[PDB]
């Protein structure tokens, strides 16, 4: 049976910590559901691409549980999710019932903001590690994938490849993992 | 004064090697206008990633010239630029005014169909190599990136970091292109 993704869309998230982990795991089987923070409309990224949500964040909850949460980042982004009750109550529900929880770049700060995942070890961007850090919740790790059970971190635009084969193998094991990667030209 | 580039995108498109591009070259500072093939609506890319262009290819080619002009890959993206003839009229244009032509993945073939550039040499994806080379118009490269002259080209998604690099580099020098990857977190 297919495993499923919500990946959250916030204004201001980072593009490619967007579409690369939606599009690989696309490429390993994994139903994936973007969802608008603010609703169904299309949503400015960062870097000014406009991407539009498969359903509201409203309507996709009602659809799960999902397999994996995914915050991308983006700061501007990442501030969105860190504010919003929606996010919250949706990633209780989801360490709650022992989902896999995976977050890049500033995405990691929702989840303090959250009060998700205390006492694991996290990375982040190196210029989101003090806000990620402030009170000494996670252990900080300067790995460019860092899985501590069930809560999954990773750094920026350039490790979103591995962030998003690392969620791939998680769900669907290490040889689907591989078989995806070969195709992407990766180094 | 600011570097311009044409991202030209069409249903089908391989999103990750739309959105790097597009974003990397933001970070360096270039206007970007991402144009819709097919005019000014959504796109569906191959991977169901939905992007809002900037604006129609007819419209964004009175904005011209660019000093880069962009095709993504994906199979199907790509034969959409191959049978266009607006991007015949738009690459034929480019090239008679040695502008930069860059290409990624499939991409690479729209230029065999629109005959730009034979006698460079390019590389793609590995599975594009044969249709690439119908006729020996080019000669081949395993190089992750290919650059002779003002025929730019790349192999993935995977590489789509470097090729954004250096279009970046090409435009921009690189001074600019390395103050630009360091904050991606590229291996
Ligand atoms: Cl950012
Ligand atoms: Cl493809």
Redo the contacts between chains.
Sequence with gaps: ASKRALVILAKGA???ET??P??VM??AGIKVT?AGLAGKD?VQC???????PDASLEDAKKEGPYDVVVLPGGNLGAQNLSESAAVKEILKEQENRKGLIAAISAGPTALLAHEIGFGSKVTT???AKDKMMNGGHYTYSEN?VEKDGLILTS?????S?EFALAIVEALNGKEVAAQVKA?????
């Excluded at 960062?46 to 539009?52: A, E, G, P, Q, T």
């Excluded at 750094?155 to 490790?159: K, L």
């Design positions: 980072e593009e490619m579409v690369i939606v599009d696309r490429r973007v299309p960062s870097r000014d691409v406009v991407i539009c961007h190196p210029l460019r750094r920026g635009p350039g490790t490849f195709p992407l030209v990766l180094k």
